[PDB]
C-alpha cells in the first residue's frame, strides 16, 4: 500500500501533522477487487476520506461493523493460531484507515478492546465459535458503550434542565441532540441557541434536528457568541475525548466557547461516555491535532474568491484545524453514564475500569 | 445655493441606503468638506445660528446612520473649532473652574474665514494620520515575533507592511465568519512576503498560546476607552487577557466618540440573516431566529495600548483626549 | 440613457376582494408601510430616474397617497408620473397604451405595485445590454428570479413555476405553472438546439421583475390577445428570445394573496429585506419612527407598554399604541394607535391602525384591518380575516377561516 | 472476493483491431486492476488471466447474465466484448464503494436517450428513451421536489460497463420478463415482486470521462475510428 | 528529556542559573554540546523573557502529598511567572520522589547553608551587623503546576493523592 501524499504547504507550527487533500485518494493505486486490504476496509477508508462519515460515535460504529464483517470473512491459515494471526492481520487495515483519515479516540479505544478480546481467545476454541463470540462481544460493546451509555446520560442531564432555560449548544453532537429531544419529550420547556462555525457548518445538522422535534431554536455564528451569551442560562458542549489530565479534546470551537462563557458567569457542561476516556494527556492543540483540506477555507463573497489561487503566493499558508483542547478549570460539570462527576475524576473512571 | 441641498440629500441617502465611502478617512474627509461648504454657502450673522444649523445637520446625519460615528465626530470637531475661534475673537468643567468662577450672539466678519483655515489644517492632518501610525511600527514590532490580527484594517495593514521592510515576523489573520474580509488582508500581506497565515475564528484561542502580540483596529473608540470593533474581537481580547498577551489598537484621532456605553440594543449593526443562514435552507427558516450582528463591544480593561497620530497612550488616559477634541455641550448633539 | 420603469399599480385580480372593494391592494400596510412605498423604494435604490405609475381601480386614493409621498417631492431623483385611465383591464392594455404614447425609449423595468425587494439590477441590466449588442434584436426581455427551496413558505403557492433553462447561456426555453400538477410535461424540441446543456430548474422564486425592451410593447400591440406577462412569455416561446437572471444574496417577492402577505411580512420584520427594515424609516416620515431592540423588537414612540406584558419575538408596535397588563404578544405586527386590553394573547396577527381589543381575547394567525373592534371573551381561530369597521360581539368564538365584513355576500356580514 | 468480471460476446469479438482480437481489449482492461479470473459467455465458434469460457447455444444480455447465476457469488461487473477505452476503472467503483450504490454505470460524450443527471454529476435521476416517449418528456413531481435541478444530456454514448449488486442478479433470475438489460432494466432501476423485497433504497450512479476513448464499436464507422485512434492508445498501454 | 526530544525535533532552550549554586551553566554546556541552541540567563530576567516562552519544563527534589513541590530556590518565582502568562509548567520526576508528608513542617523545609555563597567573607566589618540567609530549597504550591511526567506516564496534580496511596501505607507516614 503506497503512502498518501501531502497537499499544499503546511504551517511551520503544524509541520509535524499530515495534511491531505479530499480530491485525491489511495484507491487509484490499488486493486479494483481488493486483495491486500479487505473490501469492507477499503469502503470504510473511502467513506472516511470523502467525509461521508464525519462524526465520532458513527465512525466507531462503522469501524466495528467493518471489523465484524472482516472477522466473518476471516479464515485462519494452517499451522497458525487465531489469537496471533488475527491481530497481525488487522494491523495493515488500521494503518490504511489511518492513512485515509487520522483515527479518533473512540476508534482507538475500540481497536484496543477488540485486540484484547482477540488475544484473550483460548487455543482449544473452534474457529466458527470464536468468530461468533467475537461478533457477539462487538455487539455487546456497541450496545452497552454507546446505546445504553446514552440513555443514562440523557436521564442524568434531565434533572439539570429547568423550565425557561436557555441552553447554548455548539456544532453537531449525537448525545447533545438526544438529550435535548428527550428533555423536550419528558415535559421540559426551554429554548436552544445553536452555534456554528466554518467550513463544516455541521451545526445545521442539529438545528434542523430540533425544529423537527418542536424545540424553539436560534442560529448564529461563533464570532457572535459574546452577544448572545448574556441571555444564555447554561452551555451544553459535546466531547470527542476526555484526557487523563482533565482536559477536553473536542471540535476547535469548544475551548473558545468555554472561555467566553466563563466571562459571563454561564455554567459549562460537558457530556461524554466512559469509553472515550484517554489515558494520555495533552496541554495544547499543537502537539496532536488534525489538518483537514486547506481548500475548504475558500468562500465566494460577492463576485470573486479571495483565496482562489493561494498556492501561487509563496508565503501564504492556510490553516484548517479540526480539534482543540480545553483546560479543566473552564469545565464545571461532566455528565457520564456513572453519574455527574467533576472534571478531575477522569483518572478515577480510568482506574475503576 | 440648492447645490448644497442636493449634496446633503445625496450624502444622507448614501449613508442610509448602503455603503458610500468604504474607508473612515474618506468618510471624515467628505464630512469635513460638506461642513465647510455648509459654513461657506449659508448666511449666519452670529455664531449661534451657524452652530445651530451645523448641529441640526449633524443630528440628521447621525439619524441617517447611527453606527457611522465618524460623521458625528467631524461635526463635533467643527463645532469645537467654531467655539475656539469665537472665544479667541471675542476675548471644560473642572474643580479649579468650579472654585475660581456666555452666548454666541455677537457678530464678526473675518471669523468665518478663520474657521475655514482651521478646518483646512484638520484636512491636512488627515493625510498624515495613517502614516503617523505607520512610522511607529518598528517601535512595537521586533524580529521573529508572532502577531495575530482579525478582519481587514487599512491601518493595521500599513503598520504591518511598514514594519516588514526592516524586520521579519509571523502574521496570522482570523477571517470573520459573516464577512470573510480577512482573506483579502492575508493576500495583501502575502504579496509583500511576510509569511502570513489564514485561520478561522474558532481557532483564535487554539493558537493563542503561540502568539506574542496582537495588533488590531476598530471602528470607533468610546469615552471610557472601550471599543466598538468587528464581531469576534471581544473573544480575541478575552483570549489575549487569558494568556496575558498585549493587545495594541491602531486608530487615528477622528475615531474618538464622546458617547458612553449606555445605548444598548442599538450598539451593534444588524444585517440580513442571509450571510449566516442561506435562503435555500427550506421550511426551517420560519421557526429559527437568526441574528447577524456586525459590531461588538470591547471593554477597556482588555486593552493594553492605543497607537494614534500623536503617539502611544494608555486607555486610562483616553478621557483626557476626548476633552481635548470635543466640548461637553456637544456630546448629545 | 436614463433608466425608466413601468409601475402597474392596479392589480387586475380579486384575491383580496373583501379588502379590495374598500381600498386598493397597493395601499395595504405590510409593516405599517404601503406596498407601493416598498416598490418605489426598490425602484429608486437601483437607479431608476423615471417611473410611470398606471392606476385604474381607485386611482384617486393611490394618486393622493403618491402626491403625499416622498418620491414626488421636488428634491427626489426618481420622477414619478401618475398616468391614470378608467378603461384599463389588464397589463396588456397598459403596455399597449405605453406603446401608443411612446413613453419608454430603451430597456425599461416592468414590476407590479406590490413587490418587496432589495435587488440592485445592474449586473442583470449590463448582461441584458451586452446580449442585445451582439445580436440584432434578440433578448427582448430578461426576467429576474431568486434561488429558493420548494419547501420555503414564500415559494409554496400559485406562483410556483418550473423552467427549462440553458446553462451555458441563461435563456428560458420553457415556462409553465404548476397549479395542481402532480407531474410536469416538457416538449422534446427543447433538446433540438444545443443538446449539450439543458437543465430543469424548480428552485426559482418568481420575483415578477423584468428588464424589458421597447419591442415588448410592440409585440403586445401586435398580439391583441395578450393580457398578462405570463401569456406573453408562453406565446413567445412557441413561436425573439427570453433570458433570465438569478440572484442568491438578495430578496424579492410579490404579494398576491393572504399567505404570501404573511410570509412577506414575517420576512420584513425579521430583517430579511435589509436595508428595508421597520427601524430604518425609508419613507422619511415622522409618524413611523421606531427603535430596534433584542429579539427583533420594534418599539415606536409612546407605545406605553403595560406591566407584566411580554414581548417574546419579532413584534412591531406603532405610535399611539397602549397595551394592558399580562399581555403576550409575539410574531405579530400592531398598527399605530391601537388599544389592547389585559390578558390578551396575540400570535402571528396583523393589527392595522385603530384596532381596539378588549381584555381576554386570544388571537392567533388572524388579520384585523382598520378600526376593527373585538369585545371581551372572543377567540379567533387561524386564517380569520376582519375587514374595516367590523365589531365582533362578546362571548363568540369564530371558527377557522372566518371572513366577516360590512358587506353581506363576500363571506359573512356583521 | 469483491467483484466478479463477466464479459458477454453474442464474430465481432474476433475482428482484428491492430492485428489483435476485439475481445482482447476488455480482457486487457480487466487485468492491470486485480481480476485474476474472469467469466466469458461467448458462442460455440468463439474459442481460444484465467478465463472461464461459457458456450451459448437471441440470448441477449439479461438471459445470459441469469444463465450463469449459480456461478456468481458476489457483485458483478458486466462489460461487452466490443469496447475499447482508457478509463481508470477505480473512478467507477469509487461510486460503488463509498455510496454503496446498487448500480454504477460508465458513459461518455459523443463527438436520442434522455439522461437526467443531477447537479453533482454522479447521481442518476432520470433515464428514458426517445422510442418509448410518445410526444413529450414527462417528469414526476417528487423527483423535482427532492432535486430541484436536473441537468439533461442527449449526446452521450453508453459503454455497457455496469457494476451491479447481487440482489439485482437475483431479481433478473427470478423475473424472466427482462431482456437486454441496457434497454429494459437500467430505466427500470432508475425508476426506483419488486427489488425492495430482495434487498436485505435503490441508488444508481453514472460516471462520465469526456476526455477518453470509451468507444463501444457497433458499426463500420466506429470500427474504423477505433482502428485509426488505437495506435497511441497502445503506445501509452504497451 | 531535552536531549531525547532534540534528536528528532529542534527547539529553543533557555537556562536560568541559580544565584547561590550556579549549576545551570553545566546544563547549558551539556545541552549546547548536542546542538540545541541553548541560551544562558540569570534569575532576575526569568520574568523579563517570560513573555517569549511557550513551555516550561523543570524537575524537583521531592513531591509532597498534596501535589506541592520542594524545588531549588527561585522555582516558586518561575511558577508565578508561568502562571501570570498562563504558560504550562511540566515536572519531570520519577516515582521515588513522592513523600507522604504535608506542608506543615515549616522552619525546616528549606535547607540553609553557610552564608559564604551569598556574601563573601572578605567584606569586612559589616558582616557582624548583617543577617545573611542562603536557603537552598523552596516550596511550590500545587495550583502553579500543570502536569507531572513520571515512569507511569502523564498525570495531573489533583491525582497525586492517589499515587501516594498506591505506594505507602497510612501508618508509615510518621515513620
Author numbering:
A (entry chain E): 167 to 519
B (entry chain D): 8 to 98, 106 to 115, 120 to 351
C (entry chain A): 41 to 279, 285 to 459
D (entry chain I): 1 to 10, 24 to 61, 71 to 79, 83 to 136, 155 to 235, 261 to 268, 297 to 334
E (entry chain C): 177 to 351
Article, verbatim:
Refinement of this class resulted in a map with an average resolution of 2.6 Å. After docking the individual eIF2B subunits into the recorded density, we observed significant extra density next to both eIF2Bα subunits, indicating that two copies of NSs are bound to each eIF2B decamer. Interestingly, whereas eIF2α-P forms extensive interactions with both the α and the δ subunits of eIF2B, the NSs mainly interacts with the eIF2Bα subunit. Thus, despite binding to a region known to influence eIF2B’s conformation, an overlay of the NSs-bound eIF2B and apo eIF2B shows that the overall conformation of eIF2B in the two structures are virtually identical. By contrast, the eIF2B–NSs and eIF2B–eIF2α-P overlay shows major conformational differences. The surface of the N-terminal domain forms a hand shape that grips the alpha helices of eIF2Bα, akin to a koala grabbing a eucalyptus branch. In this arrangement, the N-terminal domain extends three loops that contact eIF2Bα. The first two loops sit in a groove between helices α3 and α4 and the third loop just below helix α3, effectively sandwiching helix α3. Together, the three loops extend five aromatic amino acids to contact eIF2Bα. In addition, the side chain of NSs H36 and the backbone carbonyl of NSs T35 both contact eIF2Bδ R321. NSs is an antagonist of eIF2B’s inhibitor eIF2-P, deploying an overlapping binding site. Whereas eIF2-P shifts eIF2B to its inactive I-State conformation by closing the angle between the eIF2Bα and eIF2Bδ subunits, NSs engages the enzyme to opposite effect, binding to an overlapping site with eIF2-P but preserving the angle between eIF2Bα and eIF2Bδ and locking it into its active A-State conformation.
